Scaffold this motif. Structure first.
Motif, mmCIF file in Angstrom:
data_model
loop_
_atom_site.group_PDB
_atom_site.id
_atom_site.type_symbol
_atom_site.label_atom_id
_atom_site.label_comp_id
_atom_site.label_asym_id
_atom_site.label_seq_id
_atom_site.Cartn_x
_atom_site.Cartn_y
_atom_site.Cartn_z
ATOM 1 N N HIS A 198 -5.172 9.604 -10.415
ATOM 2 C CA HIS A 198 -4.994 8.344 -9.710
ATOM 3 C C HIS A 198 -5.054 7.208 -10.728
ATOM 4 O O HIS A 198 -6.080 6.972 -11.361
ATOM 5 N N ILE A 199 -3.928 6.528 -10.888
ATOM 6 C CA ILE A 199 -3.792 5.440 -11.847
ATOM 7 C C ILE A 199 -3.900 4.089 -11.144
ATOM 8 O O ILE A 199 -3.244 3.862 -10.133
ATOM 9 N N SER A 200 -4.731 3.194 -11.675
ATOM 10 C CA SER A 200 -4.850 1.853 -11.111
ATOM 11 C C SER A 200 -4.031 0.951 -12.028
ATOM 12 O O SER A 200 -4.316 0.834 -13.225
ATOM 13 N N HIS A 201 -3.016 0.314 -11.463
ATOM 14 C CA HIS A 201 -2.137 -0.551 -12.225
ATOM 15 C C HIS A 201 -2.419 -2.001 -11.829
ATOM 16 O O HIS A 201 -2.135 -2.404 -10.700
ATOM 17 N N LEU A 202 -2.976 -2.763 -12.770
ATOM 18 C CA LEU A 202 -3.340 -4.166 -12.541
ATOM 19 C C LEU A 202 -2.346 -5.067 -13.248
ATOM 20 O O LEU A 202 -2.286 -5.101 -14.481
ATOM 21 N N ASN A 203 -1.581 -5.808 -12.459
ATOM 22 C CA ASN A 203 -0.537 -6.670 -12.986
ATOM 23 C C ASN A 203 -0.856 -8.158 -12.820
ATOM 24 O O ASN A 203 -0.756 -8.698 -11.717
ATOM 25 N N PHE A 204 -1.263 -8.808 -13.909
ATOM 26 C CA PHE A 204 -1.553 -10.239 -13.856
ATOM 27 C C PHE A 204 -0.235 -10.965 -14.082
ATOM 28 O O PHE A 204 0.392 -10.857 -15.139
ATOM 29 N N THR A 205 0.188 -11.709 -13.071
ATOM 30 C CA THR A 205 1.486 -12.372 -13.117
ATOM 31 C C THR A 205 1.505 -13.861 -13.369
ATOM 32 O O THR A 205 2.570 -14.440 -13.507
ATOM 33 N N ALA A 206 0.335 -14.477 -13.433
ATOM 34 C CA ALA A 206 0.265 -15.922 -13.627
ATOM 35 C C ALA A 206 -0.047 -16.279 -15.082
ATOM 36 O O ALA A 206 -0.863 -17.161 -15.342
ATOM 37 N N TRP A 207 0.612 -15.596 -16.021
ATOM 38 C CA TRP A 207 0.378 -15.838 -17.442
ATOM 39 C C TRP A 207 1.706 -15.718 -18.175
ATOM 40 O O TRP A 207 2.124 -14.623 -18.557
#
Length: 308
Positions: A198-207
Motif C-alpha cells: 500500500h503506497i501513500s502518494h502525497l502530492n503538494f500542489t501549491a508550490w
C-alpha cells in the motif's frame, strides 16, 4: 476508512513540544531573536552564495552515457554516481539519489529524484518496489502554466489496475483533495509473488517550480501528515528536477525533527550535507530563505501556544 479531516490534521504535531530545553520560554525567545536577526541582516542569502561555491561529489558519469542521457528530464541535472539509486541486480539507471541525514537518534532517509518521464514510469515503480518505499512526496503539479513538470505515472481512473512493468501491477484505490495537496492511495503488486503493498502518494500542489509555497501553513500540515504516515523505507521526494522543492522540503522536515529532539540546527550545514549527495538541492535564494522563514514562523506559533 474515513477521508482525512482537518481536525485529524490539526492535531498532528509539526514539532514535538518539550517541557523545557532550547525551544521553550526565555530560550525560545532567544532563538526567535537570533533567527529574526539573521534574516534582517540578509545572512541566509550570503550562506547560499557560499554553498553554490561547493564542488560536486563526482562527475555524474553514468547519467551521461548515450544510452542514459534520454532518461534525464534535464541534461544538466544528474545524480552523482556514488549516491545514485540502482535498478535491479543489473544496476540499471534512474535519475534518483539517496539522501540520508542524521537527525539526533533518528536518521531521515530520502530518495530525491526527477519527476518520471513517460519512458521511465516503469523504472520509477521498480525503484519504489526495490527500495521498499511506501510514501511518495510529489512537490509539483504535473503541468504548471504552459510547462510540463512531471508526467502522471499512476492510473487516473479509480480501481483500474495496470502493469507498469512486467512484474508490477499498479492501481489507484483512493484520491482525496485537501487544501494545497492531494492524497492518493495506491496498491503495488508483484504479480509473481502476489505480495501487495500500500503506497501513500502525497502530492503538494501549491508550490510553483523555482518558487516558494503559496500556502506555507498547508505545507506544514502536509509535512506533519507525511511524518505521521511514514512507517519504514525511504521517503521518495520528487518534483520536476528533483532538487529545488524536494531539497527545501527535506531541509524543513529535518530541522523540525531536530527541534523535536531539543537539538541545535544549522541550515547551511544541512544544505551542504544534502548537496554532497545530490547536486543543487535547494535551488533558489528565496527557497533557502524560506527554510529560515518557515522555521521562524513555526517557532513563533510554538511561543503563541506556550503563552496558552
Amino acid at each position: 476508512h474515513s477521508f482525512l479531516t482537518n481536525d485529524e490534521l490539526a492535531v498532528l504535531p509539526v514539532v514535538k513540544v518539550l517541557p523545557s530545553g532550547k525551544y521553550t520560554g526565555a530560550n525560545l525567545k532567544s532563538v526567535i531573536r537570533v533567527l529574526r536577526g539573521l534574516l534582517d541582516q540578509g545572512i541566509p542569502s550570503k550562506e547560499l552564495e557560499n554553498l553554490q561555491e561547493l564542488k560536486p561529489l563526482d562527475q555524474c558519469l553514468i547519467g551521461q552515457t548515450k544510452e542514459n542521457r534520454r532518461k534525464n528530464r534535464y541534461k544538466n541535472i544528474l545524480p552523482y554516481d556514488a549516491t545514485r539509486v540502482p535498478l535491479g541486480d543489473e544496476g540499471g539507471y534512474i535519475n534518483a539519489s539517496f539522501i540520508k541525514i542524521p537527525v539526533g537518534k533518528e536518521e531521515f532517509v530520502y530518495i530525491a529524484c526527477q519527476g518520471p518521464l513517460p519512458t521511465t514510469v516503469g523504472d520509477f515503480w521498480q525503484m519504489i518496489w526495490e527500495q521498499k518505499s511506501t510514501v511518495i512526496a510529489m512537490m509539483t503539479q504535473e503541468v504548471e502554466g504552459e510547462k510540463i513538470k512531471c508526467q502522471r505515472y499512476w492510473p487516473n481512473i479509480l480501481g483500474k489496475t495496470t502493469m507498469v512493468s512486467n512484474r508490477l501491477r499498479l492501481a489507484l484505490v483512493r484520491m482525496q483533495q485537501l487544501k494545497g495537496f492531494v492524497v492518493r492511495a495506491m496498491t503495488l503488486e508483484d504479480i509473481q509473488t502476489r505480495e501487495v503493498r500500500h503506497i501513500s502518494h502525497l502530492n503538494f500542489t501549491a508550490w510553483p517550480d523555482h518558487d516558494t509555497p503559496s500556502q506555507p501553513d498547508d505545507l506544514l500540515t502536509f509535512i506533519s501528515y507525511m511524518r505521521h504516515i511514514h512507517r519504514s523505507g525511504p521517503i521518495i521526494t520528487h518534483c520536476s528536477a528533483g532538487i529545488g522543492r524536494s531539497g527545501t522540503l527535506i531541509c524543513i522536515d529535518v530541522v523540525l525533527g531536530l527541534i523535536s529532539q531539543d537539538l541545535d540546527f544549522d541550515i547551511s550545514d544541512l544544505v551542504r550535507c544534502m548537496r554532497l549527495q545530490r547536486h543543487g538541492m535547494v535551488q533558489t535564494e528565496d527557497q533557502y530563505i524560506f527554510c529560515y522563514q518557515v522555521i521562524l514562523y513555526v517557532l513563533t506559533r510554538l511561543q503563541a501556544e506556550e503563552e496558552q
